[PDB]
Design an enzyme around this catalytic site. Structure first.
Site, PDB file in Angstrom:
ATOM      1  N   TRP A 132       0.850  -1.179   0.000  1.00  0.00           N
ATOM      2  CA  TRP A 132       0.000   0.000   0.000  1.00  0.00           C
ATOM      3  C   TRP A 132       0.895   1.241   0.000  1.00  0.00           C
ATOM      4  CZ3 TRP A 132      -1.737   2.539   4.936  1.00  0.00           C
ATOM      5  CH2 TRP A 132      -2.856   3.363   4.737  1.00  0.00           C
ATOM      6  N   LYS A 144     -12.849  -2.229   6.283  1.00  0.00           N
ATOM      7  CA  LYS A 144     -13.466  -3.032   5.232  1.00  0.00           C
ATOM      8  C   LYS A 144     -14.388  -4.117   5.847  1.00  0.00           C
ATOM      9  N   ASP A 159       0.139  -5.588   9.788  1.00  0.00           N
ATOM     10  CA  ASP A 159      -0.908  -4.678   9.345  1.00  0.00           C
ATOM     11  C   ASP A 159      -2.041  -5.609   8.918  1.00  0.00           C
ATOM     12  OD1 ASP A 159      -2.608  -3.182   7.724  1.00  0.00           O
ATOM     13  OD2 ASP A 159      -0.995  -1.983   6.881  1.00  0.00           O
TER      14      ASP A 159
HETATM   15  C1  LIG Z   1      -2.599  -2.682   3.817  1.00  0.00           C
HETATM   16  C2  LIG Z   1      -3.426  -1.607   4.395  1.00  0.00           C
HETATM   17  N1  LIG Z   1      -3.083  -1.041   5.477  1.00  0.00           N
HETATM   18  C3  LIG Z   1      -3.778  -0.088   6.038  1.00  0.00           C
HETATM   19  C4  LIG Z   1      -4.954   0.382   5.517  1.00  0.00           C
HETATM   20  C5  LIG Z   1      -5.668   1.526   6.182  1.00  0.00           C
HETATM   21  O1  LIG Z   1      -6.904   1.246   6.689  1.00  0.00           O
HETATM   22  P1  LIG Z   1      -7.869   2.418   7.117  1.00  0.00           P
HETATM   23  O2  LIG Z   1      -7.017   3.510   7.578  1.00  0.00           O
HETATM   24  O3  LIG Z   1      -8.555   2.846   5.942  1.00  0.00           O
HETATM   25  O4  LIG Z   1      -8.716   1.859   8.132  1.00  0.00           O
HETATM   26  C6  LIG Z   1      -5.405  -0.218   4.280  1.00  0.00           C
HETATM   27  C7  LIG Z   1      -6.666   0.052   3.551  1.00  0.00           C
HETATM   28  N2  LIG Z   1      -6.996   1.385   3.348  1.00  0.00           N
HETATM   29  C8  LIG Z   1      -7.271   1.556   1.954  1.00  0.00           C
HETATM   30  C9  LIG Z   1      -8.257   2.401   1.602  1.00  0.00           C
HETATM   31  S1  LIG Z   1      -8.147   2.312  -0.127  1.00  0.00           S
HETATM   32  C10 LIG Z   1      -6.959   1.185  -0.282  1.00  0.00           C
HETATM   33  C11 LIG Z   1      -6.358   0.733  -1.587  1.00  0.00           C
HETATM   34  O5  LIG Z   1      -5.249   0.215  -1.458  1.00  0.00           O
HETATM   35  O6  LIG Z   1      -7.080   0.973  -2.563  1.00  0.00           O
HETATM   36  C12 LIG Z   1      -6.542   0.893   0.984  1.00  0.00           C
HETATM   37  C13 LIG Z   1      -4.607  -1.267   3.697  1.00  0.00           C
HETATM   38  O7  LIG Z   1      -4.946  -1.832   2.571  1.00  0.00           O
END
Ligand SMILES: Cc1ncc(COP(=O)(O)O)c(CNc2csc(C(=O)O)c2)c1O
Ligand SMILES: Cc1ncc(COP(=O)(O)O)c(CNc2csc(C(=O)O)c2)c1O
Lengths: 383, 383
Positions: B117, B233, B198
């Site tokens: 990510w 999610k 993570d």
């Molecule tokens: C590996 C990983 N680590 C942390 C996160 C963050 O989660 P939130 O902060 O959104 O709860 C995410 C997901 N957040 C996210 C929103 S859009 C997206 C994408 O890769 O499209 C990813 C993730 O895939």
């Protein structure tokens, strides 16, 4: 990895909490505002997704925030000089501002009043910024030591940030008069300070518009400023973490470019902000009916604090204090220094079960008609 | 102050968004889960205050999170080795972990998979930590290049952090097998790495418990680790910012002392976390009826993604692709690399209105029975 970490530096609590950080009504409760419940019911009925907000949060929230801060029809708004990011509380707004400044500008230090909210130092230091203190309190006259303030701030260099509480100074409840704010605004321009307003209590001193007069005097004279605001107390939304970081620059091109880096600082912290509390704010502020109910609820909190200030002064006299406490009537918001020493405060807690902070600051909103007499008897006993 | 700031580095969007970051159902919507609506109605009816949560958030939320991560009856829980702070999302959990490590330990660098990510680098760099990459992807066999991974990680020194996606690797959907996780756990102990898991997709690969097997293999072998988890999610609570940072140390005394500094890092960032989304999670997880409705809703999302993976592979063949895309069936979660080049992806968007990211990653959950045929026709046209 962790075996050598040093520990970081209510529980102890006819007893009384004036050490509380929150508003309490006449019954000693911190209920959810009715306007907030109505807005929450509307959101339950109407929301069809929890899809992420933009980095800067709900657009209507930003517009309504700028109108609260600057006034509807202000040139800052018309000229598109301000950008607002919805943040997790006023603390989150301060930290976003601190990270933005540390990474994108030459700022190295932030001037904070002595005394202030103790978390100011922690937030700015977390971002790598030094904190320096400026004089503020004239304890003899129970007052703003304006000469001392101006003298202290002479040490601030051009390009330093100076933090101002917009109204209801925490902990003193002592705010600049409008003319003092105007003097500080001119001084700030001449000396090249970047003003940072921390506005956590708008509406708790005299009213929404009056409480923003100081900020507006600054905004009329400065190309650039930042405001970190909070809706924790004036919406009773503490735990929903509802605040805003508003960036102001000379023109739209500059603010938009600078704001892109503020959004980067948010994206590397918490990604995008929590919708529920801000959506309740935007729902209320953008609806004539809910806004009118909310404004009255805030007036009711403002007025109850005023009544407790007057009742505290009158009662201390009736329980045999003798001392002038009239300064309490003139101070603004939930907090004031009682003028008790740290040892008097310790005695109050140990002997009488009355809690305040060691500085002697008291939350006037913790006082009620029911607890006023024992409270004042206890205070008289330790004088 | 701002005049020289450099700008930071959907809108463009029978067209189709596979560039989306969220789950979509068969109708192309991201509705609020029914379990979540029921919990929100309960909170509307029952909440009597918005008084601040503790720095670490709602206690039940922490307990239910630790049970999801480690299993009910795990020794980590029985021995009181883990502390959980409720945070604003998985991003907030990562940043809290990064700030905690930067200020309280000797950590200087965090190892992240290539690819990951993209916000990982931004979060760790914001806290002053360097990010290094380890090999991960075997593109020829559409697979985890395990030898390359182990070889890359030989460069990691004792006391470096190594970040692992707990399941549903983003962007590849390629996860270690249990035996590979066990090999990595042993390696990590021998080399002195601090694991950082993570965990943003628990429940989207095979199931809640199966998806935590890798983390549990680590937890069985390590005195210390950190988990940054997200309920964005698996509860469809994206915008309410619901996550957790869980710290694990050798014993209760050590974890409590270390956690005090994690709480200090939170208090200097956003003070205390947003209640609404976490309270919905804790309400659901602690109630047998709501938990059963939620677990089924998550199973339904997991299964729909599985069906779309199979339908995508079958359809590409029927629209005349020719290529082996069978790897898609085996990958886990919403994301996979399609194996399209950046220029094929650009063509897809320009010529066909089909959006993916430049790496060729696609959100399988953006596919539906209705859009599958045009989507696959477009892909075949650019091969
Ligand atoms: C590996 C990983 N680590 C942390 C996160 C963050 O989660 P939130 O902060 O959104 O709860 C995410 C997901 N957040 C996210 C929103 S859009 C997206 C994408 O890769 O499209 C990813 C993730 O895939
Ligand atoms: C001057 C100033 N700045 C920022 C804040 C933070 O607001 P929130 O983060 O809670 O929204 C606050 C208020 N937060 C707060 C909670 S308890 C308390 C106190 O001083 O007792 C203060 C404040 O007084």
């Amino acid at each position: 990895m962790f075996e050598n970490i040093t520990a970081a530096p209510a529980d102890l609590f006819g007893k009384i909490n004036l050490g509380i950080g929150v508003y309490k009504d006449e019954t000693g409760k911190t209920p959810v505002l009715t306007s907030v419940k109505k807005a929450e019911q509307y959101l339950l009925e109407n929301e069809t997704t929890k899809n992420y907000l933009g980095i800067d949060g709900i657009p209507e929230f930003g517009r309504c925030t700028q109108e609260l801060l600057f006034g509807k029809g202000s040139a800052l708004i018309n000229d598109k000089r301000a950008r607002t990011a919805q943040t997790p509380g006023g603390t989150g707004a301060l930290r976003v501002a601190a990270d933005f400044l540390a990474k994108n500008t030459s700022v190295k230090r932030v001037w904070v009043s002595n005394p202030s909210w103790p978390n100011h130092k922690s937030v700015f230091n977390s971002a790598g910024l030094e904190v320096r203190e400026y004089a503020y309190y004239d304890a003899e006259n129970h007052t703003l030591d304006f000469d001392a303030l101006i003298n202290s701030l002479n040490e601030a260099q051009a390009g330093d940030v100076v933090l101002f509480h917009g109204c209801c100074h925490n902990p003193t409840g002592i705010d600049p008069t409008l003319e003092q704010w105007q003097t500080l605004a001119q001084l700030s321009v001449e000396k090249g300070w970047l003003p940072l307003f921390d506005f956590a209590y708008q509406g708790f001193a005299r009213g929404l518009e009056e409480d923003a007069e100081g900020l507006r005097a600054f905004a009329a004279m400065h190309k650039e400023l930042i405001v970190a605001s909070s809706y924790s107390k004036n919406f009773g939304l503490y735990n929903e973490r509802v605040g805003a970081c508003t960036l102001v620059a000379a023109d739209s091109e500059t603010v938009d470019r600078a704001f892109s880096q503020m959004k980067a600082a948010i994206r590397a912290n918490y990604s995008n902000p929590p919708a529920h509390g801000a959506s309740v704010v935007a729902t209320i502020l953008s609806n004539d009916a809910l806004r009118a109910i909310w404004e009255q609820e805030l007036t009711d909190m403002r007025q109850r604090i005023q009544r407790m200030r007057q009742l505290f002064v009158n009662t201390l006299q009736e329980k045999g204090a003798n001392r002038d406490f009239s300064f309490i009537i003139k101070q603004n918001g939930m907090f004031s220094f009682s003028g008790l020493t740290k040892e008097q405060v310790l005695r109050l807690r140990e002997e009488f079960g009355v809690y305040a902070v060691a500085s002697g600051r008291v939350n006037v909103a913790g006082m009620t008609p029911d607890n006023m007499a024992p409270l004042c008897e206890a205070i008289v006993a330790v004088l």
